[PDB]
Design a protein around this ligand. Structure first.
Ligand SMILES: [Zn+2]
Ligand SMILES: [Zn+2]
Lengths: 232, 231
C-alpha cells in the first residue's frame, strides 16, 4: 500500500479546543504512525489563524491525535501536516519524497471566511482554496489553485473523492481508490472541483520533478492533499 | 482544442432505422468533420450485432450522421468508430495517433443483453463492458475491462463524465472536460465505474507506448472512449 498524508478535523464550535487527526495511510482510515515512521513526522501539525502558524499539541489515545493549544474562536482556519523529506534509492538514482496535507476547518455553523484559508502557507506543493467550501452546494464549482515552489502549476491533475464513495470489499489488500472528480489545472494553476455529494472530501495532486541540487539528489516526488466538508 | 472521438446513438425502438453520430471534438457537442480532417475518417462507423460487424451508411444532414443498412431488431449492440492512424512530428520524433469510440446501444426497452456488447471488437485500445449499463443504477458499479493490443492493460487510468456535468467554456480554453469519475485498472485490466448521476456517460482511457516498428515511427498515442446511458 502506498501511504499518503491527509488531515481530518472534528466538528468544532467557538470556545472549545480544536481536535485534529494526522492521516498517514489510505484515506479515510486513520492509523497510528508506526515505530519506524515516527522520524518522518518529526514536526507537529500546525494551526493557521489570523496570527499565523502555531504548533498543535499531540494529545490523545493515539499518536496521530492533536489539539489546539488554546480554545479557538469562530472563524475559518487551516490545519496543515507534513511528511518530512525522505531519500530513497530507485532504478539507480536518489529520490526525495515529500507529502503535504491541509484541512479547511470552519469553527461555527455560519463561518465562511476566506481571509486565512486563501493565503498560501508555503507547502512545496500546495492546494490553495480560492473560496470557502461552506458556500459550495452539490453540483456547484469550488475553485482551487495549485502551487509548486510558490508558482502556479499548470496542467496538473487534481482528483477528488469523499469518505464513503468507494467502500465495497475494502481490506488491507484491496482497492477503494476511486475518485468522484478529476480535472487538470489551467495556465493560472486553477481548477474547479465539482462535488456531486455532500460529505468529507479529499482533493489530491502529485508532482514529480527534478531535485534542485543535482549534486545531492536527482528526483523529487510530491503528494499533496486538501480536505474539506461539503454540506452541513 | 484537443479533439477526441466518441459515438452517440439516438433512441431506437426495434424495427426502425438506427441513427448514430460520430463525435469528433469536445464532448458532448457534435460538429461537422472539417475538410482537412475527412481523410482521417476514411472508413464508416460499424454496427456490431449477432451477424458480426457491418458497415453503416453516411446518411443525413451533417457528415457525422450515420444510418444503419437495414432496420434493427430488439437487442444490445455496439456502434464503433475509428480515427484512422495519423503521423506527426513532436519534440524530434514521430508519433502515430489512433482513436476509437464505442457506444452501447439498447434497441427496445427492457433489452439488456450481454452477449454481443461484452465481446471485444478488436480495437488497438479498447474498453470492453463486462455488463449491460441498463442494469446499473446510480451509485452501483459498472465493471469494464481495458485491452491494449488484445491483452488486459493494468494500472490504466479510466475516467468518466456525463453530458451536463461540466457546462463551461465555448472556445476560450478548449481544455478537456472535467470528469465525474477516475480510477485505475487492476491486474486483470478491470475497473468499476461508479456513476453518481443519470444521463449520457462517456468513459475514457488513453495509452501512450512505443511504436511496434521502430524503423518507421517512434511513439504511438491511443485515445479510446465508451459511451452509454445510465438511468
Ligand atoms: Zn454543531
Ligand atoms: Zn422509448
Amino acid at each position: 500500500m502506498v501511504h499518503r498524508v491527509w488531515v481530518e478535523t472534528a466538528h468544532t464550535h467557538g470556545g472549545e479546543y480544536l481536535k485534529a487527526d494526522l492521516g498517514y495511510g489510505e484515506f479515510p482510515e486513520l492509523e497510528p504512525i508506526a515505530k519506524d515512521r515516527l522520524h518522518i513526522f518529526s514536526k507537529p501539525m500546525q494551526l493557521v489563524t489570523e496570527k499565523g502558524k502555531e504548533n498543535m499539541i499531540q494529545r490523545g489515545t493515539y499518536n496521530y491525535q492533536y489539539r489546539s493549544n488554546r480554545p479557538v474562536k469562530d472563524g475559518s482556519y487551516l490545519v496543515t501536516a507534513e511528511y518530512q523529506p525522505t531519500f530513497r534509492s530507485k532504478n539507480s538514482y536518489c529520490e526525495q519524497t515529500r507529502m503535504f496535507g491541509k484541512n479547511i476547518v470552519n469553527v461555527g455553523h455560519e463561518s465562511a471566511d476566506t481571509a486565512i484559508i486563501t493565503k498560501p502557507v508555503g507547502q512545496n506543493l500546495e492546494i490553495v482554496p480560492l473560496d470557502n467550501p461552506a458556500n459550495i452546494h452539490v453540483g456547484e464549482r469550488f475553485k482551487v489553485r495549485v502551487l509548486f515552489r510558490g508558482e502556479p502549476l499548470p496542467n496538473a491533475t487534481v482528483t477528488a473523492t469523499f469518505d464513503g464513495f468507494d467502500t465495497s470489499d475494502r481490506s488491507k489488500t484491496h482497492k477503494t481508490e476511486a475518485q468522484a472528480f478529476s480535472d487538470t489545472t489551467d495556465g493560472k494553476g486553477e481548477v474547479d472541483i465539482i462535488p456531486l455529494r455532500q460529505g468529507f472530501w479529499k482533493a489530491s495532486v502529485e508532482y514529480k520533478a527534478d531535485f534542485p541540487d543535482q549534486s545531492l539528489c536527482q528526483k523529487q516526488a510530491n503528494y499533496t492533499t486538501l480536505t474539506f466538508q461539503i454540506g452541513h
